[PDB]
Amino acid sequence: ENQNVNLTRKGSILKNQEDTFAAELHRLKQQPLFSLVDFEQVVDRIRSTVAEHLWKLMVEESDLLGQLKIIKDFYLLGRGELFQAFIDTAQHMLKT
């Protein structure tokens, strides 16, 4: 919800299946006995759907790999030769 506040109207990960889970929860409310198993199963289905849509958005839509590569190159000194040359050039400024 917080991301959809800032993100354009990308629908729920579950979209129209949210109401299906609502109907399942209503059946659970109609169940005379609370079963943890059925509740956990429904929760896990919703979780898995949301997590899969989030993963798809992050890897394909949000290019998580590019950001991780950038972080490796800069934060993790992944471009060790580049950061070595940078250190060699900036040493006089950064030695003080």
Partner: protein, 50 residues
């Protein structure tokens, strides 16, 4: 005290103990989510021992 054996369960008390230990192990072993938690017969839908 040896008197703690349940006479009505006594013929099956050993098997009961072994089964309880096995079930406690399975639930106490971090089992991967075993599909043998079939969504079919709920233990609540299982007829109780009573």
């Amino acid at each position: 005290r040896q008197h703690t054996m349940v006479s009505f369960l006594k013929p099956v008390l050993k098997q009961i103990i072994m089964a309880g230990k096995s079930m406690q192990l399975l639930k106490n072993l971090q089992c991967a989510e075993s599909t043998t938690c079939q969504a079919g017969a709920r233990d609540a839908e299982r007829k109780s021992l009573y």
